[PDB]
Amino acid sequence: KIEEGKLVIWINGDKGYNGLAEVGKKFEKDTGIKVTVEHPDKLEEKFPQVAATGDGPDIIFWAHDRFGGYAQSGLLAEITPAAAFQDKLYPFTWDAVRYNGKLIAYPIAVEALSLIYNKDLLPNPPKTWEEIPALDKELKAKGKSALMFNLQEPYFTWPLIAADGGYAFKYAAGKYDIKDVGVDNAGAKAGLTFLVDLIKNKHMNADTDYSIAEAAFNKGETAMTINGPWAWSNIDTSAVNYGVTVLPTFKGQPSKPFVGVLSAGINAASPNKELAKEFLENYLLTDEGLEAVNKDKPLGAVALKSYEEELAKDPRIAATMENAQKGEIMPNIPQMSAFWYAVRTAVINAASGRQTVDAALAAAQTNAAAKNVDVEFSQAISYVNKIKTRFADQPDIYKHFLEILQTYQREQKPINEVYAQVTHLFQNAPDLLEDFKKFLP
Ligand SMILES: OC[C@H]1O[C@H](O[C@H]2[C@H](O)[C@@H](O)[C@@H](O[C@H]3[C@H](O)[C@@H](O)[C@H](O)O[C@@H]3CO)O[C@@H]2CO)[C@H](O)[C@@H](O)[C@@H]1O
Numbered sequence: 001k002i003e004e005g006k007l008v009i010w011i012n013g014d015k016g017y018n019g020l021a022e023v024g025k026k027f028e029k030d031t032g033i034k035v036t037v038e039h040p041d042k043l044e045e046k047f048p049q050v051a052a053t054g055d056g057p058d059i060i061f062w063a064h065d066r067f068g069g070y071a072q073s074g075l076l077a078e079i080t081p082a083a084a085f086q087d088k089l090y091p092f093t094w095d096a097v098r099y100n101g102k103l104i105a106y107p108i109a110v111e112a113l114s115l116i117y118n119k120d121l122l123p124n125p126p127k128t129w130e131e132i133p134a135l136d137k138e139l140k141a142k143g144k145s146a147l148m149f150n151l152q153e154p155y156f157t158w159p160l161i162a163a164d165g166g167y168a169f170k171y172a173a174g175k176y177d178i179k180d181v182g183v184d185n186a187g188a189k190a191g192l193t194f195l196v197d198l199i200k201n202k203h204m205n206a207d208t209d210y211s212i213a214e215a216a217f218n219k220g221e222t223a224m225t226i227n228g229p230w231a232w233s234n235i236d237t238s239a240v241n242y243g244v245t246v247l248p249t250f251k252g253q254p255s256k257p258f259v260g261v262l263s264a265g266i267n268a269a270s271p272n273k274e275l276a277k278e279f280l281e282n283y284l285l286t287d288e289g290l291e292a293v294n295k296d297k298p299l300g301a302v303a304l305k306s307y308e309e310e311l312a313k314d315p316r317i318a319a320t321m322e323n324a325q326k327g328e329i330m331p332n333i334p335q336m337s338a339f340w341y342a343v344r345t346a347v348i349n350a351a352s353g354r355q356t357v358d359a360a361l362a363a364a365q366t367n368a369a370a371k372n373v374d375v376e377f378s379q380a381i382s383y384v385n386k387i388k389t390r391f392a393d394q395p396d397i398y399k400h401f402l403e404i405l406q407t408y409q410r411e412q413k414p415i416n417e418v419y420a421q422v423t424h425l426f427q428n429a430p431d432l433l434e435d436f437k438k439f440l441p
Contacts, residue, residue: 004271011061013039016296035324052073054269063260064096068332071104075275077266079103093303096261105263112324113257118120121223127275136203148213154343184365207350229300244316257327317329342367
């Protein structure tokens with residue numbers, strides 16, 4: 001039910017949506033087309049649900065890592081920029097929004113996490129993660145803390161996890177191997193273990209989130225934080241004098257932040273694709289438009305060459321790009337969301353103590369990696385054997401088992417309803433219910 005003759009835009013609540021709304025108001029005056037900018041929570045999760053039936057915004061803003069999943073699901077229109085417009089943007093940013101040979105979004109800005117530190121508490125920031133524990137002890141004797149940052153989102157903890165060898169998907173010459181995940185190798189384990197020890201030795205608190213960390217840094221309570229360029233404007237208001245620098249090294253190796261490219265995608269079900277392209281190309285992606293958003297919340301290093309050549313003179317931008325060079329630009333493949341969900345659970349479970357690092361990351365490795373088809377078939381054989389162990393007197397049990405799985409596909413049965421059908425059929429014991437979940441998660 002996307003209405004024709006208007007533009008509805010979704011953008012995350014930490015970006016400069018008020019500045020984006022002003023670009024929209026200039027668009028409305030020139031064209032008569034009302035532009036509405038909304039920032040719903042979890043918009044990156046709501047968009048696949050509403051767009052699939054033809055609803056949702058005309059334009060969705062998010063980092064490029066979500067967009068490949070959207071495109072594979074037929075939710076994004078293909079971008080049709082003339083060659084002259086494409087030359088206005090850096091080629092590596094166009095690469096970030098390319099999926100299966102097609103441009104599926106307009107890139108806006110390059111984002112990378114940096115180390116933000118209080119120059120009146122810490123004139124020289126630490127070069128290594130390893131010295132932070134003793135630095136915290138010295139600062140705790142002066143009524144301060146060393147480091148506070150968002151421990152709830154794996155975006156913020158991944159640079160340390162990846163530093164010694166962790167990775168999301170192995171890049172093998174032009175394709176990401178969705179079967180080669182590096183979430184439970186020795187490097188990822190060493191990085192998450194340093195994180196959990198920081199919490200264990202009371203240098204960080206597992207409950208710290210984005211807002212707790214931002215308030216503590218902007219009040220001068222903690223000497224360091226980890227954040228992106230969108231956070232700089234609130235620090236400008238705070239009276240804290242801060243520097244933006246390269247993240248600390250772990251085991252002598254640089255932290256590797258996942259680099260995001262903020263991108264605007266056009267809903268495939270939108271009846272306003274021409275209006276969306278005009279707004280994005282001729283209003284937002286200009287010096288005038290980006291400055292309007294950038295003055296609300298800084299965007300990072302923008303994709304537009306003309307505006308970025310002036311933004312690159314900021315040492316905070318130069319530090320952002322230095323951290324980007326040491327990190328890796330994110331894959332956009334559809335498997336990214338499962339990777340992020342798996343790592344979020346692992347960090348949270350390990351940080352709180354509910355699981356060891358090794359257990360937490362082994363479960364995340366299985367959740368993020370594609371199935372080993374030879375392994376699962378052997379488990380299917382073991383599962384069949386288990387049925388015969390407990391139901392030797394029910395010769396029709398396999399016929400009814402297959403019927404459930406067939407009807408699942410033929411009639412679009414919800415998965416949890418399939419689960420109830422399995423537990424009722426195997427009414428004797430629920431081990432067959434637990435064993436079944438792996439085959440259909
Ligand atoms: O943790 C569960 C969430 O995992 C996924 O979110 C990813 C994003 O897809 C990824 O872009 C990055 O988000 C950051 C974003 O780039 C930045 O502009 C914003 O200001 O900060 C974000 C970090 O909070 O990292 C997160 C993972 O932390 C998934 O898409 C999302 O639905 C899950 O809820």
